[PDB]
């Protein structure tokens, strides 16, 4: 048996364990350890948005209760249910 390996911050600066990626706490000065949460002030969330143009939004708009992406994927645990509106 052989184990796996950790994650390295894109800005250099730091290297963190794999389980601190998307753990809802900001460990990276450039926000790169939290692409899927609202945890970093300078992060970005990628909306694939099939059927329209892909879009990046501020991390602060992930699970803020507001539908920022036409595919609705920025709201996955907020009590706001976003319908797909990419037409």
């Amino acid at each position: 048996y052989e184990e796996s390996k950790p994650f390295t911050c894109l800005d250099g600066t730091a290297t963190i364990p794999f389980d601190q990626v998307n753990d809802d706490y900001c460990d990276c000065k450039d926000g790169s350890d939290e692409p899927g949460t609202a945890a970093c002030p300078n992060g970005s969330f990628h909306c694939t948005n099939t059927g329209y143009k892909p879009l990046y939004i501020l991390s602060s708009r992930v699970n803020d209760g507001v539908c920022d992406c036409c595919d609705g994927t920025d709201e996955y645990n907020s009590g706001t249910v976003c319908e797909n509106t990419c037409r």
């Binding site: 609202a38 602060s60 507001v66």
Partner: protein
């Protein structure tokens, strides 16, 4: 400046009469043969020695160490006004006892001591003592004056306006002596310094809710609100005086071993005064709160940032403003609609061209989790096609003139009538008008702004209602003037509650106010001007309101009149970001100044100020819960926290929020630094931007730049923040908390945090809330419950702890009830002695402890 349209004291005939009585031997004397000790009060007859007029003094000791003095005529031709609806309860009394007497005096003991009242018979006089220490005297200068109702002292004119004055001279007045006091505060609203000035060589301070166009600074003219409450502070004690009179009132202040004398002069009503004996200023806060209540708990959104102007032009403009905040990464909770949103200033309507679909506009704002405020003034356009006017006219709910017709004056819609908000039937009608069926186009995210409720009457004397207009029960307008606006505020707030079935907390901004207005929402200082000295004066004005219970105060950010230069607008955002009511507003003819319209260096400074405010929302919310529960002001003068530091007694370019944050905003163009006075023997203060620690007491020279907001956290405190700034407070209110622990020199700290759903009365009706105590001592941080009755379903957790003034531990250990002991990682800066504990991950509803080893 055109001030001839406002009366000086010499032009007010009752003030001229009263103020011509100078200190000397009072003609009043108490007839000790008439003395009666009752279940709640001592009553004794007074007599004017020359006129033989007979009065009744009603003297009461009250629970919570207060005294109430009421004086009325023994045999009045008709009843005098007694102010209703301001006291929240009939104050609980304490028993008086005759504990001494001679031929010219009676000594009374309140309950079993230590407070005593010495009633002197001739000349009439009252002395208030704790044991043997004289606290205060009444009528010591012999200025008591009581004009009895007889069978320009009568008919009187000012400018082209005529007061028929059908009841003649009825003014009352009384003086108070405060031995040992050199500093007095309160009686808002005036564009004047926090420490009140002596009036000996000029005008008394005037209390008469009036609309003063382009009001000027450092003068005692009456402005829009009147709170007749005066606080006195010395190194040794605090006292308050609450003069419960709703008529036009003038206040003289004189100094004289050191002693301050206060004289109140009111046009009508009875003499009704509460003496609040402290001894600490927090005792006075509690005493006054027991009488008039506490600050209504604001819905959380209303503590965010409000974007307003006269006027956003249509629905598209409002939605462009809303989208502008998001496109420029700036938070905002509320966009405001001034009077041009209505149909020709017919309130409760919408302009049919520019606001044709208000429900749809509100739905768009709701989808951004933002609110809207619409203005609703109390003047009703005289217009037979206007259903509001027709209902009020048909039901006889308007203020009347002496000949029985409805009063008609001039305001924004032209000719307008004024509902009688002193009539409970009118207030009930008003509240029901805010139902979603009656106020068509409104929705749960629409809140209200009451303006011009002094009431402002453009063709009236002093721009207000005629003194001899007639209200419910036949009382004259001169009797009730200063509570008219309060009644508007009250009825509107009750409307927003009722329309929700009693569930939603209201938000109402009001211009005019009185004692008790803190129960109904927020106030602001009216039409200020875009100039540096108006930026400065926002601190003493809101401090004077804070001291008398109105904690939800602010000034128009940027100034209402004129165009602020960009540096001034930046500094005003930074100032407003640390004041309770935080709204940018502007006159119709000003340039647009939404904050993203400025050059990028100014935008970034304003954005930074907005981010600081939103991050501090848990702190603001908890301070307002403490105001709501205890009556303690949110924004505080330094002397409230440092009562023995005499160098703080006049400071008004700095203030505290609670006991934890000291703020010195930059308020001069081109400033290179500020002088910050950091008080407290053995106290330390932390610069929250650099974490540099500073010992007190000192005056620190702090260099500043455009983005500087000088803010210091006091050692021994814990400040909760939401570090994830979002576009509005609704978006943030389930987010995790970061705790900022500022260690005392003894290595200790403590703080609180209140949480609830952010907008309902469920904290009260169902005890659905959390009140947490955070405390640090030794090397352990502990979260425990500060109120076990409160439970709350919430996802909020503790994501981070920042400890200032700490050394580097060897290990950090977290214990939570229900979980195994856990190890936390941490980062430590040896330069600043700042310790950051990574992701505790514990629910804010859970007891827990963190140990630094």
């Amino acid at each position: 400046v055109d001030r001839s349209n406002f009366k000086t004291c010499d032009e007010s005939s009752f003030c001229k009469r009263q103020r011509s009585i100078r200190p000397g031997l009072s003609p009043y004397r108490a007839l000790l043969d008439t003395l009666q000790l009752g279940p709640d009060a001592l009553t004794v007859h007074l007599i004017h020695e020359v006129t033989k007029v007979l009065l009744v003094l009603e003297l009461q000791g009250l629970q919570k160490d207060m005294t109430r003095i009421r004086i009325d005529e023994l045999e009045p031709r008709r009843p005098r006004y007694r102010v209703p609806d301001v006291l929240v309860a009939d104050p609980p009394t304490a028993r008086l006892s005759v504990s001494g007497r001679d031929d010219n005096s009676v000594e009374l003991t309140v309950a079993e001591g230590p407070y005593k009242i010495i009633l002197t018979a001739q000349p009439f006089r009252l002395d208030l003592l704790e044991d043997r220490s004289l606290l205060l005297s009444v009528n010591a200068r012999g200025l008591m004056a009581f004009e009895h109702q007889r069978a320009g002292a009568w008919e009187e004119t000012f400018k082209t306006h005529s007061d028929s004055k059908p009841y003649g001279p009825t003014s009352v007045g009384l003086d108070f002596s405060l031995p040992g006091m050199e500093h007095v505060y309160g009686i808002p609203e005036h564009a004047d310094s926090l420490r009140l000035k002596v009036t000996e060589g000029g005008e008394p301070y005037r209390l008469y809710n009036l609309d003063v166009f382009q009001y000027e600074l450092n003068n005692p003219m009456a402005l829009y609100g009147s709170v007749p409450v005066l606080l006195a502070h010395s190194f040794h004690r605090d006292l308050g005086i609450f003069w419960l009179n709703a008529a036009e009132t003038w206040v003289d202040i004189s100094s004289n071993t050191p002693q301050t004398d206060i004289r109140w002069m009111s046009e009508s009503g009875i003499i009704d005064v509460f003496l609040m004996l402290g001894p600490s200023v927090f005792d006075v806060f509690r005493q006054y709160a027991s009488l008039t209540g506490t600050q209504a708990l604001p819905p959380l959104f209303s503590l965010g940032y409000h974007q307003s102007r006269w006027n956003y032009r249509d629905e598209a403009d409002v939605l462009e403003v809303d989208q502008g905040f998001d496109d420029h990464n700036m938070p905002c909770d509320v966009i405001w609609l001034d009077i041009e949103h209505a149909d020709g200033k017919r309130y409760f309507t919408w302009d049919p061209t520019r606001f044709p679909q208000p429900l749809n506009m509100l739905e768009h704002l709701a989808s951004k989790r933002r609110k809207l405020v619409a203005i609703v003034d109390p003047h009703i356009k005289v217009d037979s096609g206007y259903r509001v006017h027709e209902e009020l006219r048909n039901h006889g709910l308007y203020v009347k003139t002496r000949d029985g017709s409805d009063y008609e004056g001039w305001c924004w819609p032209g000719s307008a009538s004024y509902p009688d908000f002193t009539n409970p039937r009118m207030r009930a009608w008003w509240s029901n008008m805010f139902s979603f069926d009656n106020y068509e186009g409104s929705a749960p995210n629409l809140y209200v702004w009451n303006d011009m409720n002094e009431p402002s009457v453009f063709n009236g004397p002093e721009v207000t209602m005629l003194k001899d207009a007639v209200h419910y029960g036949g009382w004259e307008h001169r009797d009730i003037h200063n509570i008219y606006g309060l009644y508007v505020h009250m009825a509107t707030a009750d409307g927003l509650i009722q329309r929700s079935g009693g569930i939603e907390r209201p938000f109402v901004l009001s211009r005019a106010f009185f004692s008790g207005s803190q129960r109904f929402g927020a106030v602001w200082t009216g039409d200020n001007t875009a100039e540096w000295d108006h930026l400065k004066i926002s601190i003493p004005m809101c401090l004077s309101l804070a001291l008398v219970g109105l904690s939800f105060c602010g000034a128009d950010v940027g100034g209402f009149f004129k165009n602020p230069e960009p540096e001034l607008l930046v500094r005003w955002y930074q100032m407003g970001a640390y004041q309770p009511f935080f709204r940018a507003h502007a006159h119709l003819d000003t340039g647009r100044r939404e904050p993203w319209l400025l050059a990028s260096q100014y935008q970034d400074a304003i954005r930074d100020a907005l981010f600081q405010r939103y991050s501090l929302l848990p702190f603001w919310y908890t301070l307002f819960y403490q105001a709501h529960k205890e009556g303690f002001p949110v924004m505080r003068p330094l002397w409230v926290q440092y009562p023995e530091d005499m160098s703080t007694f006049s400071i008004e370019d700095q203030f505290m929020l609670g006991d934890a944050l000291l703020i010195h905003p930059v308020s001069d163009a081109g400033a290179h630094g500020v002088q910050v006075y950091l008080p407290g023997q053995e106290e330390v203060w932390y610069d929250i931007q650099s974490y540099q620690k500073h010992h007190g007491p000192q005056t620190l020279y702090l260099p500043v730049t455009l983005s500087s907001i000088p803010v210091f956290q006091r050692g021994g405190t814990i400040v909760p923040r939401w570090m994830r700034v979002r576009r509005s407070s609704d978006c943030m209110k389930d987010d995790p908390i970061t705790l900022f622990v500022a260690l005392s020199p003894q290595g200790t700290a403590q703080g609180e945090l209140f949480l609830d759903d952010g907008h309902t009365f469920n904290y009260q009706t169902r005890h659905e809330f959390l009140l947490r105590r955070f405390s640090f001592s030794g090397s352990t941080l502990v979260s425990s419950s500060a109120d076990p009755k409160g439970h709350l379903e919430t996802p909020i957790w503790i994501e981070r702890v920042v400890i200032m003034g700490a050394g580097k531990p060897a290990a950090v250990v977290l214990q939570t009830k229900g979980s195994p002991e856990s190890r936390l990682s941490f980062q430590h800066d040896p330069e600043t002695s700042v310790l950051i504990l990574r992701k505790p991950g514990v629910s804010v509803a859970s007891d827990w402890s963190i140990h630094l080893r």
